[PDB]
Scaffold this active site. Sequence first.
Site, PDB file in Angstrom:
ATOM      1  CB  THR A  90       8.611  86.603  92.244  1.00 41.17           C
ATOM      2  OG1 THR A  90       7.207  86.325  92.244  1.00 41.17           O
ATOM      3  CG2 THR A  90       9.158  86.375  93.642  1.00 41.17           C
ATOM      4  CG  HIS A 105      -4.205 103.184  85.987  1.00 40.01           C
ATOM      5  ND1 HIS A 105      -3.013 103.841  86.211  1.00 40.01           N
ATOM      6  CD2 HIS A 105      -4.212 102.123  86.829  1.00 40.01           C
ATOM      7  CE1 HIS A 105      -2.334 103.210  87.153  1.00 40.01           C
ATOM      8  NE2 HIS A 105      -3.038 102.163  87.543  1.00 40.01           N
ATOM      9  CG  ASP A 160       5.603  83.683  91.647  1.00 44.08           C
ATOM     10  OD1 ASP A 160       4.878  84.688  91.834  1.00 44.08           O
ATOM     11  OD2 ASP A 160       6.793  83.641  92.018  1.00 44.08           O
ATOM     12  CD  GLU A 169      -6.215 100.954  94.505  1.00 44.87           C
ATOM     13  OE1 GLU A 169      -6.496 101.922  93.817  1.00 44.87           O
ATOM     14  OE2 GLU A 169      -6.641  99.870  94.235  1.00 44.87           O
ATOM     15  CG  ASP A 175       0.387  95.882  87.644  1.00 43.98           C
ATOM     16  OD1 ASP A 175       0.653  96.603  86.694  1.00 43.98           O
ATOM     17  OD2 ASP A 175       0.764  96.181  88.751  1.00 43.98           O
ATOM     18  CB  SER A 178       4.668  86.588  94.402  1.00 44.18           C
ATOM     19  OG  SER A 178       4.357  87.500  93.363  1.00 44.18           O
ATOM     20  CG  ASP A 215       1.700  86.925  90.558  1.00 44.44           C
ATOM     21  OD1 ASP A 215       2.889  86.625  90.301  1.00 44.44           O
ATOM     22  OD2 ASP A 215       0.914  86.147  91.133  1.00 44.44           O
ATOM     23  CG  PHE A 218       9.371  83.558  87.892  1.00 50.06           C
ATOM     24  CD1 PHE A 218       9.771  83.181  86.617  1.00 50.06           C
ATOM     25  CD2 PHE A 218      10.341  83.835  88.848  1.00 50.06           C
ATOM     26  CE1 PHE A 218      11.111  83.063  86.298  1.00 50.06           C
ATOM     27  CE2 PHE A 218      11.691  83.718  88.538  1.00 50.06           C
ATOM     28  CZ  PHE A 218      12.074  83.336  87.258  1.00 50.06           C
ATOM     29  CD  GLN A 269      -5.909  96.966  91.390  1.00 49.81           C
ATOM     30  OE1 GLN A 269      -7.050  96.667  91.538  1.00 49.81           O
ATOM     31  NE2 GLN A 269      -5.374  97.943  92.019  1.00 49.81           N
TER      32      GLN A 269
END
Length: 595
Positions: free
Chosen positions: A184, A351, A188, A258, A108, A190, A110, A186, A105
């Site tokens: 992003t 999932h 990385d 979540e 994903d 994020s 990212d 990448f 998760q």
Amino acid sequence: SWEVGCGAPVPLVTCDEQSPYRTITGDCNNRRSPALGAANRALARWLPAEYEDGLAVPFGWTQRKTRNGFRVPLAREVSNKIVGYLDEEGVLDQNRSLLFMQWGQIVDHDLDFAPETELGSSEHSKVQCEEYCVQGDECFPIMFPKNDPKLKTQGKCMPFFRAGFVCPTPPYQSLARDQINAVTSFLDASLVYGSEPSLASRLRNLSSPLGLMAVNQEAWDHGLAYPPFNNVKPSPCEFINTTAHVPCFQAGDSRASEQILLATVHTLLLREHNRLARELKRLNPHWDGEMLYQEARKILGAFIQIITFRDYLPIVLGSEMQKWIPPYQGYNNSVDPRISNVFTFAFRFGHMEVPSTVSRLDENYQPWGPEAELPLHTLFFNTWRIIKDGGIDPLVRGLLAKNSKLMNQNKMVTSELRNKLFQPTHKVHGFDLAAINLQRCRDHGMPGYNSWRGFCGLSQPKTLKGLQAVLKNKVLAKKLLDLYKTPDNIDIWIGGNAEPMVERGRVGPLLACLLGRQFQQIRDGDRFWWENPGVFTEKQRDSLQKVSFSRLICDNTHITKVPLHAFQANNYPHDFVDCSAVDKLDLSPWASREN
Ligand code: HEM
Ligand SMILES: *[C@@H]1O[C@H](CO)[C@@H](O[C@@H]2O[C@H](CO)[C@@H](O)[C@H](O)[C@H]2NC(C)=O)[C@H](O)[C@H]1NC(C)=O
Ligand SMILES: *[C@@H]1O[C@H](CO)[C@@H](O[C@@H]2O[C@H](CO)[C@@H](O)[C@H](O)[C@H]2NC(C)=O)[C@H](O)[C@H]1NC(C)=O
Ligand SMILES: *[C@@H]1O[C@H](CO)[C@@H](O)[C@H](O)[C@H]1NC(C)=O
Ligand SMILES: *[C@@H]1O[C@H](CO)[C@@H](O)[C@H](O)[C@H]1NC(C)=O
Ligand SMILES: NC(=O)c1cnccn1
Ligand SMILES: NC(=O)c1cnccn1
Ligand SMILES: [Ca+2]
Ligand SMILES: [Zn+2]
């Protein structure tokens, strides 16, 4: 084809072009085409989109309009008949820890996020879709089939809103609708730092020149940090518990709260950045905040990359690993690092790895308190269970000592997700992630199962018997053609996940090909790949070589006992060692001598 660069993209980007650090938005990574892999652009199309009108309207939108001469089956009906099951006994993955699911998760989040369109702040179509289940524009409701129990208790449909798309928000009419990736491409971190300058800055602690990420000032985890609260309302985390009034967290990615174990992992990563920034201060007192932040950020990014490619992907792809992601050969600027639209559905194999419950475990890895095990559904957007119920440590222990759900042709998605999903702004624990996935597949104009089979050099079953052979399952194949009259019409998410798993892996041949190609691309075409010569020094790379999720836990929690191989199924106390036995990240090669 159509404009090679369609508008509606912020254009205020200038590349430093010598900057040793990634931008926040991902721009400037590829020097020849600086927008490639940048957030808030169109998802890549590996194959032309397929919509019922060739442009934007999903298959299943117009009742009469067929796909290859056949009506597409209701998403919720495919869910009921194929994806659901009753018995949670025996479903657990005997050789994958619960962390294996959770890391999936994380990676994903990212890589991709295609948010629902907005266009209705005072919006009442937000209620016209909710209340009356009337399809129009961006309201694409998931209708219940006859015999569906939810028809008796929840009305005529589940609300569903179409994903946002590039250029204009309002529908365009000459070229195929393209959905947005808001993060992003990448790998990385994020999800930690944000993919927008606006968010990246708010997340930072710019009160002290220490290059730290801001932390919760309200609550603490026995002296350890929480992410800051998102103080905007209405908040779904407050909603799921009126009395508790504990808001969702604020992370570099909006989806962070979540579920409790995702919030937990985001907490670990935030702690890691601040831990790193502190060490980088000791070693380099002369480094200002920006240098510290950038340098810690860059380290964490390398950490995520290595865990993913060295530990995670080999046990997802198994025998297909080397076929799609060969050993690294350096950066290749000819490679498109963009996440494809189909990958965002391929990665939803996760999932079926999610189990029905989450446990809190004490220091002997035994049940923590009287209600140690909880149903997964009571943990959607639940932050109070963290702050008002023992912090993240008991949950991390669960991540280590408990199992992921095993994908099962007979038992695909737990009802905690398939019947009791809670969605924000929506009020009930009564949604169906599987149905959503399928509806979303069509929303995104996915080619069918066989188109992707062909894409991957695999055979394309045309009959019930061909499909039975491909899936190695008579009953499942029967159900699938009963619903989809041809395997050409089978939505990619269910089709790909229906295939039996490859040797040593947790996905089938079709998925291993789609995932494998994508991850190969995000690595090969990333100018800041951790192992691209020049990104780090060779000595630095030797240090990064020994990072482990085990070490991450030791360094950032009060857990003192961990397994060496965090992703396999590990039992306490046998498979667990002391943290003292665990290799640490040697930051000494980051010491930067002045004179
Ligand atoms: C309890 C755990 C999880 C929950 C509650 C959850 C829930 C959700 C929800 C509500 C969506 C949005 C669906 C839509 O509106 O189209 C989503 C999307 C997605 N999920 Fe999960 N999920 C979980 C675990 C995972 C795992 C383990 C993986 C992979 C290993 C995964 C991969 C994805 C991907 C790729 C998307 C699409 C993201 C995008 O917009 O690009 N999920 N999930
Ligand atoms: C931003 O960083 C500053 C400086 O580290 C934080 O302020 C300190 O807070 C600590 C708690 O860790 C207190 O004990 C001290 O009074 C402060 N220490 C120093 C050395 O000044 C501040 O809390 C941070 N702000 C956010 C939002 O994270
Ligand atoms: C919402 O959160 C509150 C606050 O933690 C939960 O109340 C706790 O639950 C039990 C009593 O059933 C006690 O062990 C705690 O001391 C309670 N605290 C308070 C302040 O009442 C409550 O159970 C949660 N409710 C839901 C529906 O999740
Ligand atoms: C458990 O998984 C690991 C790979 O993650 C593998 O090395 C080991 O052999 C597996 N055990 C079995 C019995 O498959
Ligand atoms: C670089 O990428 C291009 C485009 O994907 C590919 O054709 C080429 O073989 C790659 N170069 C090397 C040396 O592998
Ligand atoms: N795992 C996911 O991709 C996800 C989780 N929560 C909201 C949206 N997406
Ligand atoms: N789809 C979700 O579950 C979600 C959760 N948090 C923020 C946004 N989306
Ligand atoms: Ca990213
Ligand atoms: Zn403690």
